[PDB]
């Protein structure tokens, strides 16, 4: 028994909720929150900018130090950094950005990073301004992640479409 409440049951291991991931993390303070990162950990917009803004830019400061030491992530890759005021840990995961011409096949590789964590609060990878169809991202999530994932979808109209079209 954990502290996520309000999640509609999609599968055995996937629950889903209509929420902004930032406001969700502030309430639950999960062990792991997933950021929809880019390879440079440049948190300008979307979930990354919203998560980063909620940490008063401490996420960006930590991220810049990580990149200066280690170089960029791979598309499909991840790193674990601090969760700051939002979670114990932030798993920064790079899904492919369709709008930059990255290979959508790497979405499954991105979701495999979630399997290293027993429980996560996460968004649908490659969604929003990453340019992929959320219905596809949800399908890959359900077919790839085996650990317990609590998904957040910000737009009500999209959340409703995701639930109503889920097979």
Ligand X SMILES: CCC(=O)Nc1nc(C)c(S(=O)(=O)Nc2cccc(C#N)c2)s1
Per CB under 6 A, residues contacting ligand X are 20-22, 36, 45-47, 50, 123-124, 127-130, 152-155
Cβ at position 70, least distance to ligand X in Å: 23
- 28: exposed, middle or buried (C-beta count within 10 Å: 0-12, 13-18, 19+)? middle
What CA–CA distance (Å, rounded) separates 107 from 155?
21
Residue nearest to ligand X (CB): 46
Nearer to ligand X, 52 or 81 (CB): 52
What CA–CA distance (Å, rounded) separates 76 from 110?
4
Cβ at position 84, least distance to ligand X in Å: 16
SS3 105: coil
Residues in the chain: 167
Nearer to ligand X, 61 or 129 (CB): 129
What CA–CA distance (Å, rounded) separates 4 from 73?
30
Cβ at position 115, least distance to ligand X in Å: 19
Nearer to ligand X, 1 or 113 (CB): 113
């Amino acid at each position: 028994v954990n502290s996520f409440s309000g999640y509609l049951k999609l599968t055995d291991n996937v629950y889903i909720k209509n929420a902004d991931i930032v406001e969700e993390a502030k309430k639950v303070k999960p062990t792991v929150v997933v950021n929809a990162a880019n390879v440079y950990l440049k948190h300008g917009g979307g979930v990354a900018g919203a998560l980063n803004k909620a940490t008063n830019n401490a996420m960006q400061v930590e991220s810049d130090d990580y990149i200066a030491t280690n170089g960029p992530l791979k598309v499909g890759g991840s790193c674990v950094l601090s969760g700051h005021n939002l979670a114990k840990h932030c798993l920064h995961v790079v899904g492919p950005n369709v709008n930059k011409g990255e290979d959508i096949q790497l979405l499954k590789s991105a979701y495999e990073n979630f399997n290293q964590h027993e429980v996560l609060l996460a968004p649908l990878l490659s969604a929003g301004i990453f340019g992929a169809d959320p219905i596809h991202s949800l399908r890959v999530c359900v077919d790839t992640v085996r650990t317990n994932v609590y998904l957040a979808v910000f737009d009500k109209n999209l959340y409703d479409k995701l639930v109503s079209s889920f097979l």
